Amino acid sequence: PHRAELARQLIDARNRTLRLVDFDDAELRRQYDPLMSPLVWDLAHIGQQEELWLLRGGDPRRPGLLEPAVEQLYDAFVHPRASRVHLPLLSPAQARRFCATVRSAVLDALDRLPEDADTFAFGMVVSHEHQHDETMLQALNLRSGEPLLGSGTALPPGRPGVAGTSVLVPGGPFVLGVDLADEPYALDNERPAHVVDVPAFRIGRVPVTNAEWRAFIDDGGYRQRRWWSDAGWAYRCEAGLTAPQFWNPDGTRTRFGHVEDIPPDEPVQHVTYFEAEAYAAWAGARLPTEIEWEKACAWDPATGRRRRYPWGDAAPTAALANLGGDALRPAPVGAYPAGASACGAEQMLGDVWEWTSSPLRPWPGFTPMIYQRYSQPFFEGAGSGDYRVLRGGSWAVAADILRPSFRNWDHPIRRQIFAGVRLAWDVD
Numbered sequence: 419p420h421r422a423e424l425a426r427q428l429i430d431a432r433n434r435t436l437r438l439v440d441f442d443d444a445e446l447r448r449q450y451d452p453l454m455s456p457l458v459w460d461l462a463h464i465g466q467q468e469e470l471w472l473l474r475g476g477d478p479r480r481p482g483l484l485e486p487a488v489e490q491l492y493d494a495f496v497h498p499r500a501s502r503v504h505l506p507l508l509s510p511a512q513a514r515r516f517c518a519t520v521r522s523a524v525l526d527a528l529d530r531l532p533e534d535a536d537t538f539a540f541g542m543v544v545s546h547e548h549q550h551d552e553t554m555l556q557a558l559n560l561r562s563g564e565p566l567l568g569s570g571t572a573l574p575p576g577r578p579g580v581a582g583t584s585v586l587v588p589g590g591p592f593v594l595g596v597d598l599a600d601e602p603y604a605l606d607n608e609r610p611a612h613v614v615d616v617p618a619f620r621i622g623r624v625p626v627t628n629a630e631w632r633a634f635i636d637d638g639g640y641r642q643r644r645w646w647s648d649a650g651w652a653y654r655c656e657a658g659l660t661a662p663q664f665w666n667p668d669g670t671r672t673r674f675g676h677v678e679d680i681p682p683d684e685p686v687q688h689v690t691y692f693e694a695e696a697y698a699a700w701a702g703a704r705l706p707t708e709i710e711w712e713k714a715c716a717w718d719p720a721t722g723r724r725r726r727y728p729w730g731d732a733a734p735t736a737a738l739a740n741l742g743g744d745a746l747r748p749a750p751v752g753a754y755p756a757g758a759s760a761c762g763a764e765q766m767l768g769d770v771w772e773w774t775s776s777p778l779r780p781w782p783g784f785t786p787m788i789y790q791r792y793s794q795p796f797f798e799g800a801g802s803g804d805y806r807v808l809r810g811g812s813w814a815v816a817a818d819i820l821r822p823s824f825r826n827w828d829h830p831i832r833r834q835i836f837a838g839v840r841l842a843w844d845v846d
């Protein structure tokens with residue numbers, strides 16, 4: 419909002435990016451997994467997108483620092499993830515230089531903007547950079563070899579009495595989504611604020627834990643097709659799923675290259691949508707819709723009002739939620755009692771992205787932002803395949819870019835993302 423605050427947010431995002439690529443050139447060029455770009459791709463792409471949206475008015479016909487053919491190497495629509503390791507990409511030195519030149523021009527542009535000028539694009543780019551920072555963390559977690567990152571900063575302890583339990587979300591109208599007047603940098607798929615009727619339902623007080631997931635494995639959950647959808651079972655069989663990713667046969671897990679015991683009370687992480695819906699069915703429950711999820715997060719039934727965050731309007735802090743990337747893991751369930759929503763659901767923001775049963779769809783009145791292909795190509799039926807929405811952010815998401823209305827999405831077969839499960843139930 420204040421130009422100084424935007425500059426601070428862009429600088430904070432770039433600091434984060436540069437820490438994540440502060441390794442030798444050969445590391446940045448490696449393909450850690452065919453699902454993921456080499457880190458050097460995301461680095462140059464971050465700069466190219468910043469240039470496009472802030473210096474070139476989102477018009478690719480306007481000249482950029484790079485030749486158009488070079489610039490198009492960083493267009494995700496043209497280049498599948500797996501192919502990017504073989505593309506003739508900018509070197510790390512070239513990419514850093516390019517990023518720095520763009521940033522210098524962007525900070526100058528910010529200083530020159532007329533009073534009361536619109537600054538939406540600047541906040542959109544802050545969001546874009548942080549989201550690629552989480553993508554790069556996914557890649558670093560997939561990397562085979564001795565750890566490049568540490569084990570993460572301290573988190574609060576969990577507490578007993580929350581795991582497995584649910585809270586009631588009384589039925590009726592609520593306001594879904596937000597307007598720019600409320601949230602000046604809400605992305606296009608979050609808008610507009612509008613009323614929806616949501617029947618009474620219950621939602622998990624905390625996410626499903628590792629120890630709870632182990633019970634699903636031990637009971638033969640991955641060997642019993644009745645819990646799975648037709649597509650989910652087919653995929654389970656094709657991919658040979660038998661446990662969350664990174665769980666090892668000896669009962670340990672590998673997290674950013676660190677082999678460690680699986681903590682029993684941590685939210686389960688790195689499971690597919692198909693695994694999530696199967697666990698839910700086996701447990702006597704289901705997945706929430708994203709609309710149910712957002713009502714549980716943001717609505718205060720005592721006041722008939724939306725809250726800015728589940729806890730109220732206070733900016734996120736380390737006492738309220740696990741965000742920002744430093745922990746490199748979710749916190750034990752029950753670790754954030756003060757971060758509870760009005761209905762009592764805890765850890766809705768931060769820790770793990772939570773699968774929902776909803777495909778990405780526009781709210782009525784949707785209109786695209788300057789980056790018109792950010793949401794639209796991935797709407798249900800738009801021709802890009804199947805997606806399911808995830809909510810709430812993970813331990814890796816910057817507080818600056820997260821809201822109850824924020825919408826992530828991915829193919830249901832993906833689990834290298836930092837994703838877990840929160841249950842829901844019908845109420846008769």
Ligand SMILES: N[C@@H](CCC(=O)N[C@@H](CS)C(=O)O)C(=O)O
Pocket residue numbers: 455463494499553827828829832
């Ligand atoms: N989530 C999709 C990938 C979506 C995607 O391509 N995102 C661009 C955004 S620039 C990227 O390559 O990072 C998948 O895993 O298949």
Ligand SMILES: CN(C)[C@@H](Cc1c[nH]cn1)C(=O)O
Pocket residue numbers: 546549550553792825826827828
């Ligand atoms: C929201 N998320 C799925 C997008 C965000 C993004 C980054 N660049 C373009 N879109 C993605 O990772 O592809």
Ligand SMILES: [Ca+2]
Pocket residue numbers: 765766767768769770771772809810811812
């Ligand atoms: Ca969450």
Ligand SMILES: [Cl-]
Pocket residue numbers: 492493494495
């Ligand atoms: Cl792109």
Ligand SMILES: [Cl-]
Pocket residue numbers: 567568569570571744
């Ligand atoms: Cl660390």
Ligand SMILES: [Cl-]
Pocket residue numbers: 724725726727730731
């Ligand atoms: Cl509020």
Ligand SMILES: [Cl-]
Pocket residue numbers: 434438551742743744
């Ligand atoms: Cl980080």
Ligand SMILES: [Cl-]
Pocket residue numbers: 798799800801802803804
């Ligand atoms: Cl489609």
Ligand SMILES: [Cl-]
Pocket residue numbers: 803804829830831
């Ligand atoms: Cl898919």
Ligand SMILES: [Cl-]
Pocket residue numbers: 702703704842843844
């Ligand atoms: Cl149900």
Ligand SMILES: [Mg+2]
Pocket residue numbers: 426427818
């Ligand atoms: Mg800030």
Ligand SMILES: [Mg+2]
Pocket residue numbers: 578
């Ligand atoms: Mg206990």
Ligand SMILES: [Mg+2]
Pocket residue numbers: 585586761762
């Ligand atoms: Mg209650």
Ligand SMILES: [Mg+2]
Pocket residue numbers: 597600611
């Ligand atoms: Mg309003």
Ligand SMILES: [Mg+2]
Pocket residue numbers: 637
């Ligand atoms: Mg038993």
Ligand SMILES: [Mn+2]
Pocket residue numbers: 463467546550
């Ligand atoms: Mn991008």
